[PDB]
């Protein structure tokens, strides 16, 4: 009777960058959604396709926990049917997404006085991301007709940019930690129930 490792995802000391978002496969455990009901004053708890009060009464085959960090102005894109640099090139949710999205302001954790350039995001990509696609490529983006051959310069730019989280920034430009819980139920034995 193992408990689902939700503490390991939310209470992790470091989160991954949005372009290389981490995914923890959670299965064969007893899930407690009452600790995610109401964590703190941050109430980023928009659930899509499923009700929060009904999660304890449902069993799922697998539960995926995706974690990353973006700015405040970009949390509105972590939702089904959204567009933008984050939604199109970093982390895209399907149109029929069934799950909940959680976010909280982590300005006291992920922002340094000199700028926390550790968190990155993808700026250039030739096409949009499919749902639940992770692109960790760092190939020099070819914005012109001349081939780059790994030479950074004009029309040949590095596809990743830094966030530079400073604690004095505006709320919209402060770091936010996001945890997306995907609920899957395909032809398989359901192992993640509530209690």
């Amino acid at each position, epitope marked *: 009777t193992n408990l689902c490792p939700f503490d390991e995802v939310f209470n992790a000391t470091r989160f991954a960058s949005v372009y290389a978002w981490n995914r923890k496969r959670i299965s064969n455990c007893v899930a407690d959604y009452s600790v995610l009901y109401n964590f703190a004053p941050f109430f980023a708890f928009k659930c899509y396709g499923v009700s929060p009060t009904k999660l304890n009464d449902l069993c799922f085959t697998n539960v995926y926990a995706d974690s990353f960090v973006i700015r405040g102005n970009e949390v509105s894109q972590i939702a089904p049917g959204q567009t933008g*640099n984050i939604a199109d090139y970093n982390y895209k949710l399907p149109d029929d997404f069934t799950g909940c999205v959680i976010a909280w302001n982590s300005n006291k954790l992920d922002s340094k006085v000199g700028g926390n350039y550790n968190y990155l995001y993808r700026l250039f990509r030739k096409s949009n991301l499919k749902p639940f696609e992770r692109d960790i490529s760092t190939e020099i983006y070819q914005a*012109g007709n001349k081939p780059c051959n790994g030479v950074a310069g004009f029309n040949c730019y590095f596809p990743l940019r830094s966030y*530079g989280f400073r604690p004095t920034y505006g*709320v919209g430009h402060q770091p936010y930690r996001v945890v997306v819980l995907s609920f899957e139920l395909l032809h398989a034995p359901a192992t993640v129930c509530g209690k």
Partner: antibody
Amino acid sequence: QVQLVESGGGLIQPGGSLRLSCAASGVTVSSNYMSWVRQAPGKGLEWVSIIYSGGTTYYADSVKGRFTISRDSSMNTLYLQMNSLRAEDTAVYYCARDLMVYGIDVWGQGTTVTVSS
Amino acid sequence: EIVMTQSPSSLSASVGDRVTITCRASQGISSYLAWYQQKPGKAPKLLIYAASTLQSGVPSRFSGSGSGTDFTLTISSLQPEDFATYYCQQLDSYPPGYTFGQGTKVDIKR
């Protein structure tokens, strides 16, 4: 030769339709953030529309429902279809390659659109 | 929408002066700002991007500074080819817009 060449501007009565073209060489339209910026006589710059390399488009509130940005990858050309034109649309229309955080580096020479009855 | 208030509207300067232009956003935009130069009848020219990074090919007398809401462009030694109109832009993609400043005309002081 890195340059943007605009065309299609001219005189048209209000409510008419007009299609601007932006022929590019050097920069690939289907691979870049391409933006349309206009400037009325004696006024400042105003952003109009943008088309992402992934296909996402975004329009200003004043031209939502009237303008449609597009591109022909085989022609390497950016387009701005302007319907329901109004007098306040009279401006020089620039097409430009947007680099987001790196500014807007490549500008066209501009085409003049005049809407008057 | 973000409102970019640029000041002064016009300023007079002789060759060699230290020129300063101010650009203020209505809310925190961190470092998402750019400066442009425009001469009558010509297309705009990118000078500074990312608030304080100098575009390639721009003379080193140009320099940007500031972060958050208050930004300043600085010409350390005004040259004859620098008499023009300058704009600031909010490259931040929220709320879209990419609002430009009102503009500052720099004429010849006499």
